Design a protein around this ligand. Structure first.
Ligand code: L87
Length: 275
């Protein structure tokens, strides 16, 4: 764990408030004093009192993964506290919380260019993650955090592994656990839909067996209200049945960089599911 995560001194951490509930314990906000004396706001996950040794290994396991990434669009690991209790994982603070809950509060309140900026960040983070040989497997708006400047960053590495949420998972990964960077691109397509839908749930409350069967039959989520044609086409490209025909994350970033540069192109606007 200490290979990729520095041990922090608990005397340098102050806890301010509880801002979330985790699988392994609470999530809090607070402050960290760095060796340079600079003080930064941080998020702190704590391991619940009375944890089993297995829970501890799973909890810290996420930090070992997160710690291998240094990128503007992947949540920064400040470090861990293991030598005292409670055991903690400390990351950079993200003022606006999870992306899905954030967008739900602001339905139709952002410009297309702002939403594209968010999507570009996510795609750039995923490009780095895939470059490093990791498949996330849980890429979803709820696992993206967003800061005061609207910068989006991939978080939650609980399911990730070196090379399951049905609604976000590619058909081949559902069918026989074929997880690749192309299955993450499928997931990214779902995130793209979530963003353009301001946090609508993918497939709403459809039974899981019907999400599985419908997608396998060729059905896809419909265009969100007022969705630019270019962005809906990108979803469809991400959702190709043949994984080899899906764009790579580098191509997705490049697509989005073009849309940011030419805000004009976004002016062409596009059963519940579409075949
Ligand atoms: C999708 C991640 C959920 C847990 N987590 C983390 C986080 C994520 C992974 C490992 C360690 C931590 C502290 C930061 N933050 C933050 C944050 O900085 N700011 C927030 O508002 N929320 C809700 C957070 N929730 C988390």
């Amino acid at each position: 764990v200490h290979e990729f995560a520095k041990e922090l001194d608990a005397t340098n951490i102050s806890i301010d408030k509880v801002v979330g509930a985790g699988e392994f314990g609470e999530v809090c906000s607070g402050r960290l004093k760095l060796p340079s004396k600079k003080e930064i706001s941080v998020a702190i996950k704590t391991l619940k009192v009375g944890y089993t040794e297995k829970q501890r290994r799973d909890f810290l396991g996420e930090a070992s993964i997160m710690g291998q990434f240094d990128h503007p669009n992947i949540i920064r690991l400040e470090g861990v506290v293991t030598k005292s209790k409670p055991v903690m994982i400390v990351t950079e603070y993200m003022e606006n919380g999870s992306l899905d809950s954030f967008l739900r509060k602001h339905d139709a309140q952002f410009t297309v260019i702002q939403l594209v900026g968010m999507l570009r960040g996510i795609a750039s983070g995923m490009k780095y993650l895939s470059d490093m040989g990791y498949v996330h497997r849980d890429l979803a708006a709820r696992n993206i955090l967003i800061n005061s400047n609207l910068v989006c960053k991939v978080s939650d590495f609980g399911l990730s592994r070196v090379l399951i949420p049905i609604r976000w998972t590619s058909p081949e990964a559902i069918a026989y656990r074929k997880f690749t960077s192309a299955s993450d691109v499928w997931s990214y397509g779902i995130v793209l839909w979530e963003v353009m839908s301001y946090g609508e749930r993918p497939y709403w409350e459809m039974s899981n067996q019907d999400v599985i069967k419908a997608v396998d039959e060729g059905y896809r989520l419909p265009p969100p209200m007022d969705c630019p044609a270019a962005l809906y086409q990108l979803m469809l490209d991400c959702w190709q049945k043949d994984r080899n025909n899906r764009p790579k994350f580098e191509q997705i970033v490049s697509i989005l960089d073009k849309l940011i540069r030419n805000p004009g192109s976004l002016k062409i606007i596009t059963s519940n599911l579409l075949l």
